[PDB]
């Protein structure tokens, strides 16, 4: 009984631990903020997963976990200063997009490690996260659809173009269009490193390309909620079947890099943001396929501007699915003021339905 | 005056027709709604029209042909599993999209003929047809605006970017941005292809480079309403015209690569989505020399990723002229739900404006 | 006292000479409206500053003056036949696209000066700068946005991609995407020039590089609005800093190819738009900031096409920075209907004050 009090204790938002956190002091619910959207990348509103995922960033590698933490500070101070919301900072909502920015600007960052330059865009970046977040809501809350990592992808694409491989100050890797075929050699394809796509693609959501930091990130998703964690390998699974399928080269999948789009999408509209049921199920594992072959699309697109495909395809493939209309009620996409760790949403969806019932 | 009856019955939408169908077989039912499906790419509501257009696509090539109806026949079962609409389903409104994904796969596909595997993609692309369609209606809705052909642009152009021309399993034709000038000797134009240009255009909606396949969707036109068939001649004449007055290679004209855009375009201004009206015929004149214009734009754009500039440009150009705001009631902007065939909505046109006059 | 009197006549809008205009000919109401539109590219709505700025053009080019000239004229007699509006036309909001589109498609050809037909393409662009403008009215009307140069910047697009610097009839210049890594010697740096970059910069609003026509467009600034003025310069300003930053080439810093969307981003955000508070001339300043490195993003993505960030970088930074939703009342977005010029603006945001006070 002392476990189960203490797993709902650390499961879920931890809804006790935020009221308790609007006591303190300033700086000790920054850090807590900063933890909670370090965290809210995966979808997930937990500090504990946050202090998890942060110990996963140091394992791989310290500068770029130094960047995302600085970016993460920022932009929850940004948001701040222009009185953006809280209960939108005070769950992350304004950081998630600082972390990812920091760690993407350090990992796609030619110049090297501890270059310390790279803190002023990265300064500059995270406190524009919160002002592009809000324009983007003042258009996509006209359908009840979430920002999503659209503040990222805008900022950091902005970032490697405007700067590119060829600028003296902030250089970028080198990143073209593919010329000349490449032979896929279905025998050498070692089905040891293809299975560990599914950590590596997890990961990979962070930056990250080490399976250990797969693994701490998977951890730190089944704390808060199994369904985000089960969704979450479902996604890198479709991801690395997807990949195959499409003659990608057999690196890229081993590296996760057609993961991390389809575990976003399969946690988004799988339970996140639609209510959880089979249909919807199988709408999240469609939407993840979509997610992946998108995630091809994109980059072979923006491999001509010399930028990766960040998280656009999560983006568009998420809001694509979050857009439909259908005639089944099966299919519920949840309000936004309502939207919590799916397993809530699901409890909601249930009071919802006997209400209605009777 | 049994003509007279006849033809009423085979004219339109064939709307006795569709009532009698709504009562046999669901396999019959799915036959008739692909068929009319395959006319609507041409705005077009027909049955007949529709196993004109299969039988004209036959005449061309037998492979796009039968990639065609497996796209449009799938498109309509996913949209009946995503439970979308009767009606919209049965108009064919969810089937043109998806025989578009299918002609203009097989089209730019560089495996060969009978190509089995690249069924694969069209069952998948086919398939969500729906889904983005339905998303795009969320958003076009707002401003009561069709969706158009904006599924097809997208999902081809995915399909046709994250493959490529360097894939092992789908290639595509090589697209590659104008590098070198090329001199237009004007005494070397041939004024019978010229001429040709206007059934070989009207034939490229579908991908056919065929003058005999343009005749006989030309017939097919004819036989549903004369508006279109004039308003989609003169869009081809513009078109012709337009890539003429842009130094565009003679070739290209030829083939009708200028025609198309334009032919949709003045179809769906001119009749279609407003009330015909002089004022109106003038509109879709000039929206179809801005869609051949910006058919060159976007073609010289996505030249550069390797993709073809499929609808776009009639996509474009016709919601840029149908959002357009006027002081004058001569342009009247047809309500989606009370849209048909052009002759039908000028006789709502009528209908109102008598009313409104009493 | 004569001088407040004459000072006010020629100030601001000149409400008084546009009442008087309400009489006169028809012609002479085109003439005036011209002046107008061509004066508010600047976000200025004054005809003698119009004038100014015409000299200006023509101390630089003629060839470029008369194109632009024509622009604006056919733009304007494209309004009044699609029965745009009054009062939009007569304040000049469908000349500036008009006069932007034949000025920028002079500096842009390279047939040569004194290409007459160069007009065709101007006489026909103008002409649909009022069709796109109310297009994508109808798309930003709903979040109360402005157009802004909009219009211009998808229609000189078009043509600059659609020919292109290789079709014969109508060349363009030829841009390159950056290749080679080039060294910026900080020891070359010229202050002159470097401080020249703010007359060139807001010069360069309207294509010209010169530094007289930029300071006769900050005297025509000037006699509109002193605050107008003021954020220009600072506005150029930080487009010049926010260049030497990001490891831009100098040259394109003396030729003020980094202060022209930065000028009209502190313009627009700064006053024009928000009410003037000293939060809003910081959130103007950092709009300015995200401005010129958003030019740089756009200069580098479409330099791949063969095009160069007109104005588009404007564009999306205002319509970034004015569509954030902030908890605090001092940024305060004024209504579309209440905007003139900026000091205007401001006894309008004091009367509004007042008034909830009691």
Same mark, same amino acid.
């Given at each position: 009984?002392?476990?189960?009090?203490?797993?709902?204790?650390?499961?879920?938002?931890?809804?006790?631990?935020?009221?308790?956190?609007?006591? /303190?002091?300033?700086?000790?619910?920054?850090?807590?903020?900063?933890?909670?959207?370090?965290?809210?990348?995966?979808?997930?509103?937990?500090? !504990?997963?946050?202090?998890?995922?942060?110990?996963?960033?140091?394992?791989?590698? @310290?500068?770029?976990?130094?960047?995302?933490?600085?970016?993460?500070?920022?932009?929850?101070?940004?948001?701040?200063?222009?009185? /953006?919301?809280?209960?939108?900072?005070?769950?992350?909502?304004?950081?998630? %997009?600082?972390?990812?920015?920091?760690?993407?600007?350090?990992?796609?960052?030619?110049?090297?490690?501890?270059?310390?330059?790279?803190?002023? +865009?990265?300064?500059?970046?995270?406190?524009?996260?919160?002002?592009?977040?809000?324009?983007?809501?003042?258009? %996509?809350?006209?359908?009840?659809?979430?920002?999503?990592?659209?503040?990222?992808?805008?900022?950091?694409?902005?970032?490697?173009?405007?700067?590119?491989?060829?600028?003296?100050?902030?250089?970028?890797?080198?990143? /073209? +269009?593919?010329?000349?075929?490449?032979? !896929?050699?279905?025998?050498?394809?070692?089905?040891? /490193?293809?299975?560990?796509?599914?950590?590596?693609?997890?990961?990979?959501?962070?930056?990250?390309?080490?399976?250990?930091?797969?693994?701490?990130?998977?951890?730190?998703?089944?704390?808060?909620?199994?369904?985000?964690?089960?969704?979450?390998?479902?996604?890198?699974?479709?991801?690395?079947?997807?990949?195959?399928?499409?003659?990608?080269?057999?690196?890229?999948?081993?590296?996760?890099?057609?993961?991390?789009?389809?575990?976003?999408?399969?946690?988004?509209?799988?339970?996140?943001?639609?209510?959880?049921?089979?249909?919807?199920?199988?709408?999240?594992?469609? &939407?993840?396929?979509?997610?992946?072959?998108?995630?091809?699309?994109?980059?072979?697109?923006?491999?001509?501007?010399? !930028? +990766?495909?960040?998280?656009?395809?999560? &983006?568009?493939?998420?809001?694509?699915?979050?857009?439909?209309?259908?005639?089944?009620?099966?299919?519920?996409?949840?309000?936004?003021?309502?939207?919590?760790?799916?397993?809530?949403? !699901? @409890?909601?969806?249930?009071?919802?339905?006997?209400?209605?019932?009777?």
């Amino acid at each position: 009984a002392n476990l189960i009090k203490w797993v709902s204790f650390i499961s879920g938002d931890m809804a006790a631990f935020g009221e308790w956190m609007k006591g /303190q002091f300033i700086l000790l619910q920054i850090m807590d903020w900063v933890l909670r959207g370090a965290a809210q990348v995966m979808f997930v509103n937990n500090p !504990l997963s946050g202090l998890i995922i942060f110990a996963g960033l140091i394992l791989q590698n @310290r500068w770029w976990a130094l960047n995302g933490f600085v970016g993460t500070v920022f932009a929850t101070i940004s948001a701040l200063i222009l009185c /953006q919301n809280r209960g939108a900072i005070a769950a992350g909502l304004y950081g998630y %997009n600082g972390i990812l920015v920091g760690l993407l600007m350090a990992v796609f960052s030619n110049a090297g490690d501890w270059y310390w330059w790279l803190l002023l +865009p990265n300064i500059f970046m995270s406190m524009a996260c919160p002002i592009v977040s809000s324009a983007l809501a003042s258009i %996509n809350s006209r359908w009840d659809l979430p920002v999503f990592t659209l503040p990222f992808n805008i900022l950091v694409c902005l970032h490697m173009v405007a700067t590119g491989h060829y600028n003296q100050y902030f250089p970028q890797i080198l990143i /073209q +269009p593919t010329t000349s075929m490449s032979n !896929l050699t279905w025998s050498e394809l070692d089905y040891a /490193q293809l299975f560990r796509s599914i950590p590596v693609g997890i990961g990979q959501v962070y930056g990250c390309d080490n399976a250990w930091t797969g693994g701490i990130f998977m951890i730190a998703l089944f704390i808060s909620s199994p369904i985000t964690f089960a969704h979450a390998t479902i996604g890198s699974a479709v991801g690395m079947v997807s990949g195959l399928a499409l003659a990608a080269p057999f690196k890229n999948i081993y590296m996760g890099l057609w993961g991390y789009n389809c575990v976003l999408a399969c946690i988004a509209i799988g339970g996140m943001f639609y209510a959880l049921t089979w249909q919807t199920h199988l709408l999240a594992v469609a &939407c993840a396929f979509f997610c992946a072959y998108l995630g091809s699309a994109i980059g072979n697109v923006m491999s001509n501007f010399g !930028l +990766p495909a960040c998280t656009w395809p999560f &983006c568009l493939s998420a809001l694509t699915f979050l857009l439909i209309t259908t005639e089944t009620k099966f299919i519920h996409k949840l309000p936004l003021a309502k939207v919590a760790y799916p397993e809530q949403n !699901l @409890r909601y969806y249930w009071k919802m339905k006997k209400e209605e019932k009777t």
